[PDB]
Amino acid sequence: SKFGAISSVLNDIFSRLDPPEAEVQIDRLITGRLQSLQTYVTQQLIRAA
Amino acid sequence: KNKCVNFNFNGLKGTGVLTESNKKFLPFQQFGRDIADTTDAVRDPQTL
Amino acid sequence: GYFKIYSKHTPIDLPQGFSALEPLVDLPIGINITRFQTLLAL
Amino acid sequence: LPVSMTKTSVDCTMYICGDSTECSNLLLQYGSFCTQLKRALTGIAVEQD
Amino acid sequence: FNATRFASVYAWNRKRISNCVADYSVLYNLAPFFTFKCYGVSPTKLND
Prior knowledge:
This is part of a larger assembly, with five copies of chain A. Chain A is mainly α. The first copy, chain A, contains two helices and no strands. Chains A and E meet through loops of A and loops of E. Chain B: It comes from Severe acute respiratory syndrome coronavirus 2 (2019-nCoV).
């Protein structure tokens, strides 16, 4: 998933965009993946209960 | 090959191990991608 | 802007079998196409 | 009646960053989210046993 | 880039560039080039 960014893989995001600019997309991807992982952990906790 | 080395093949940057391939690719294909945008295979732009 | 030519040959109306079309040539130029016409060799 | 599940451990760097080295330097600024996730997964693994 | 005649905003020219080696280092090295804007790409990362 792109998670609102221009690309899904961050390896080319760090290779095509400058560090001052790619930080927004990297933080967007990090926030999206952290939210997905937290939702997964909440669902796993409900399943474990 | 057969060693953990940083590969840069036609702009594709990353870290992985290059091994001997046993799969047969079609003559028009150039990339093999796994589930969730996982680059599993690649062809050499020099020796094909 | 790229004209694509996909073709596949299979020995044999159209049968109920399944067969995919494999890419043959990818022309990197495209024009404004509205009509087309075939040619014969009688 | 099910009594146990599959104990799953998710890594933070390999999932969020993968094989990127510049990405691992940015996860340290978010705090201890991964510490919470690993602790919850370890708790679930001990709970199933 | 340094052609003698350039077209207007209508019926603009378009050239197909393929099977060669591009070198964008000469572009930003020129003095009278004032504005150099890009979308999603960086000027320094155009060589890799």
